[PDB]
Amino acid sequence: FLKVKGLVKQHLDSFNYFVDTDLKKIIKANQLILSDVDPEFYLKYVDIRV
Amino acid sequence: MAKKAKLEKRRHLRELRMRARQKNASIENEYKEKVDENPFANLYNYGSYGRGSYTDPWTVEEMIKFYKALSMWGTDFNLISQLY
DNA sequence: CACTATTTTCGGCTACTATAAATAAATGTTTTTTTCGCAATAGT
DNA sequence: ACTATTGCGAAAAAAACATTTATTTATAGTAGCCGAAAATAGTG
């Protein structure tokens, strides 16, 4: 058990899930910044890489 | 790729001169040209964002309409600007 | 092997800030402040 | 809803004050756009 699946399971596997999956889930919740002045202007967050 | 495309940029600006010689807001934003940015293309130097441009070099056909109004009046830039 | 066409290769040119130092009526804006309007909010 | 009391918001404006309008020298330095020419490479 401890060989393939260590003793710092909790801090490795939680942070490594944050890097891959959840970082895409944040910019998809705050995509498409917009302004009221110049209404035909937009900027969009398409992806995230660390 | 950026250096060879630079010559194409001024190529459209030559044909503009000789032709002169002769929700709803996002719909047209989709109709605009979509392009990828390569950092070498937009590059700026000292020759950027400054007064002046390249004047069209003059012709002999322009000389005869120049020298005749130059001869009638003393020196009047005003009306000859509308002539050309 | 040799023509024809082209992509360099090389100036050529044309402009163009500068500089000061006048003149000057605009001719911009800035901060600083003050004015004036509207909406902000809540109680009519 | 609508009217009044509120705060800020925007804009004047004031005073200053540097920023524009046309000259002339060049001189060296960029920088853009244009052929001018010259070699080179595809292809006949």
UniProtKB/Swiss-Prot annotation, chain A:
Domain of life the protein comes from: Eukaryota
Compartment annotation: Nucleus
Coiled-coil residues: none
Family affiliation: Belongs to the RNA polymerase beta chain family.
Quaternary assembly: Component of the RNA polymerase III (Pol III) complex consisting of 17 subunits.
Biological function: DNA-dependent RNA polymerase catalyzes the transcription of DNA into RNA using the four ribonucleoside triphosphates as substrates. Second largest core component of RNA polymerase III which synthesizes small RNAs, such as 5S rRNA and tRNAs. Proposed to contribute to the polymerase catalytic activity and forms the polymerase active center together with the largest subunit. Pol III is composed of mobile elements and RPC2 is part of the core element with the central large cleft and probably a clamp element that moves to open and close the cleft.
Miscellaneous: Present with 1950 molecules/cell in log phase SD medium.
Name of protein: DNA-directed RNA polymerase III subunit RPC2
Gene name linked to the record: RET1
Part of the full-length chain shown: 51 to 100 of 1149
Swiss-Prot record, chain B:
Signal peptide per UniProt: none
Localisation per UniProt entry: Nucleus
Superkingdom of the source species: Eukaryota
Name of the protein in question: Transcription factor TFIIIB component B''
Oligomeric form and interacting partners: TFIIIB comprises the TATA-binding protein (TBP), the B-related factor (BRF) and the B'' component (BDP1). Interacts with TFC4.
Protein family per UniProt: Belongs to the TFC5 family.
Organism: Saccharomyces cerevisiae (strain ATCC 204508 / S288c)
Coiled coil: none
Domain SANT positions: 53-84
Function per UniProt: General activator of RNA polymerase III transcription.
